[PDB]
Design a binder for this molecule. Structure first.
Ligand code: SNG
Ligand code: SNG
Ligand code: SNG
Ligand code: SNG
Ligand code: SNG
Ligand code: CA
Ligand code: CA
Length: 400
């Protein structure tokens, strides 16, 4: 499946891939390299709660390739600017980080976790991640001109910003290719319409175009607290479609192929509020689990993990419980135990990793959307080793 950057998952992972694990702990940054030797390595004495005063409430911490060598660097939007530790290539990183731009920060430009969104993305096909922010007046970009040189921020589009009424408690904003040129476009679930804005590839987006009168707070009664929405390729043409977990179950609107969108249809009477699914209890994801390389549905429910496989065209097979674990009944909690659907093995069929109370656990896809046994990875990066959602940030990420 394709590169989509979302609020929930701001660090995309590759399909196929062998993702690593990265934790911003109280003491700094730690990695678990996906390899024959599984261990935790501390790489940076910074970007932590007690290593630089980093706070989930004020600061943003991401991974992105900022040089074009396909190795992920550590990027932090700190108190007064953007800080970067680059990947040295050998399971080490530059420490300390350097400040590349005095903007996109709590005390540089007045950026706020409660009002604004900050991502890193290669928006101009340079091979390097630019800084992209949904701020007050619209979307701002700072161009990554290479050699650690980031240009002053410029307005990319006067839309999708706080000034245009966009709110984190009502609306959703994504970056995803909806046209097929490989450039990430804006997809925004607004007050009463889904909008797209076409990336021109030059640090600007085209005027926003309304494409769907649904999936929004004021179009079908879609709420942030009950009804998660995602953007993903459901058909295999590498153009993103829309999928929402609504009241009756799963609704889609399929891309016509040019970034306009078709009718909204209920495609599966499961994974929705009426089947007992709750944002506070459960995790719902779309990722490629099969050799069809299309979005399949995965839900971490009460009794375990449930999967519905896409036939290749956006229609879905029966729901099956594939793993009797990682579920609310087994003690897993949204507010304690991060769970990700990510390729860990390199076959293109996403696997499961969960940061449990005591250990990190994985479960491998057999290659067909069914799963083997649960595997212990390590006894670290967990609640009992001092990791909480309030004070730490954890990701699956392809470091290399
Ligand atoms: C006075 Se901000 C503080 O600066 C030091 C370097 O002086 C840096 O090590 C920290 O990471 C940074 N923390 C944040 C949150 O920005
Ligand atoms: C790239 Se900072 C951005 O700068 C413009 C002018 O440059 C200012 O009006 C914005 O309010 C400020 N902050 C945010 C959060 O959008
Ligand atoms: C009256 Se809603 C408002 O409409 C205008 C015009 O279409 C659009 O440019 C804004 O982005 C949209 N804002 C949200 C939050 O939906
Ligand atoms: C009163 Se539910 C509402 O039903 C209509 C069709 O009746 C559908 O278009 C909406 O998308 C759906 N909203 C959610 C959140 O499920
Ligand atoms: C009483 Se849990 C329930 O089990 C059925 C199958 O028995 C499954 O199809 C549902 O989607 C699942 N819901 C949740 C929240 O896990
Ligand atoms: Ca595009
Ligand atoms: Ca796999």
């Amino acid at each position: 499946s394709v590169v989509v950057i979302s609020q929930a998952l701001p660090v995309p992972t590759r399909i196929p891939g062998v993702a690593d694990l990265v934790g911003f702990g109280n003491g700094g940054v730690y990695i678990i390299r996906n390899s024959l030797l599984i261990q935790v390595v501390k790489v940076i004495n910074n970007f932590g709660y007690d290593a630089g005063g980093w706070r989930v409430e004020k600061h943003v911490r991401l991974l992105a390739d900022t040089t074009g060598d396909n190795q992920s660097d550590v990027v932090g939007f700190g108190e007064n600017g953007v800080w970067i530790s680059t990947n040295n290539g050998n399971n080490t990183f530059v420490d300390p980080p350097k400040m590349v731009l005095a903007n996109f920060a709590y005390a540089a430009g007045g950026w706020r976790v409660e009002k604004h969104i900050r991502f890193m993305a290669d928006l101009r096909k340079t091979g390097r991640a630019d800084i992209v922010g949904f701020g007050d007046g619209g979307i701002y970009i700072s161009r990554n001109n290479g050699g650690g040189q980031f240009a002053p921020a410029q307005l990319a589009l006067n839309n999708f910003g706080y000034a245009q009424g966009w709110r984190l408690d009502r609306h959703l904003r994504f970056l995803a290719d909806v046209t097929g040129d490989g450039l990430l476009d804006v997809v925004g679930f607004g007050e009463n319409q889904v909008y797209i804005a076409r990336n021109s590839g030059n640090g600007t987006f085209q005027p926003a175009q309304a494409v769907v009168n649904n999936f929004c707070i004021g179009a079908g009664g879609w709420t942030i607290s009950a009804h998660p929405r995602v953007v993903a390729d459901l058909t295999g043409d590498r153009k993103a479609d829309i999928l929402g977990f609504g009241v009756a179950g799963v609704y889609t609107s399929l891309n016509n192929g040019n970034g306009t969108f078709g009718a909204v249809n209920l495609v599966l009477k499961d994974f929705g509020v009426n089947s007992g699914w709750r944002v506070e209890k459960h995790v719902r994801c779309v990722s490629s689990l099969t050799n069809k390389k299309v979005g399949d549905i995965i839900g971490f429910g009460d009794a375990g993990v449930y999967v519905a496989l896409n036939n290749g065209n956006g229609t879905f097979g029966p729901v099956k419980r594939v793993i009797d674990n990682f579920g609310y009944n087994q003690g897993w909690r949204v507010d304690k135990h991060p769970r990700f659907v990510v390729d860990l093995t390199g076959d293109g069929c996403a696997d499961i990793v969960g940061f449990g109370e005591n250990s990190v656990w994985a479960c491998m896809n057999k290659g067909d959307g069914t799963f083997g046994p649960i595997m212990k990875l390590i006894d670290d990066m967990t609640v009992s080793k001092g990791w909480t959602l309030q004070k730490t940030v954890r990701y699956a990420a392809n470091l290399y």
